[PDB]
Each structure stands twice: as structure tokens, then as C-alpha cells.
């Protein structure tokens, strides 16, 4: 899985949010 | 990367945190 801003994209599944590099991201798989 | 409780596993290190299902998780890569 990985972190994306602002949103996960088609084909992915979101499981909450990353706090990574001092930023908030969607956690996408 | 993965979000884990309680901790990262072998082959991974912590790169931040996740928020999912009302809890904080280790962000592991």
C-alpha cells in the first residue's frame, strides 16, 4: 500500500489516513 | 507499506503513523 494526496484512485481501496513526512495522506491499497 | 498494530515486522521500519478505525497504527515500509 502507499500514501496519496488527495485521494485514492479507481482500482484502489482506502484504509484510513497516513501521517507521513508531516503531512496527511489517503492510505491506498 | 502497511499499517500495523502493535509494531512493524521483520524487514520493515517505521516511517510514520496511520489513522484507521478509530486507532493509531505504525506506518511500516
Curated annotation (Swiss-Prot), chains A, B:
Disulfide bonds join 1-29, 3-18, 8-28. This is Neutrophil defensin 2. It comes from Homo sapiens. The gene is DEFA3.
Amino acid at each position: 500500500c502507499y500514501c496519496r494526496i488527495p485521494a485514492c484512485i479507481a482500482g484502489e481501496r482506502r484504509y484510513x489516513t497516513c501521517i507521513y513526512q508531516g503531512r496527511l495522506w489517503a492510505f491506498c491499497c
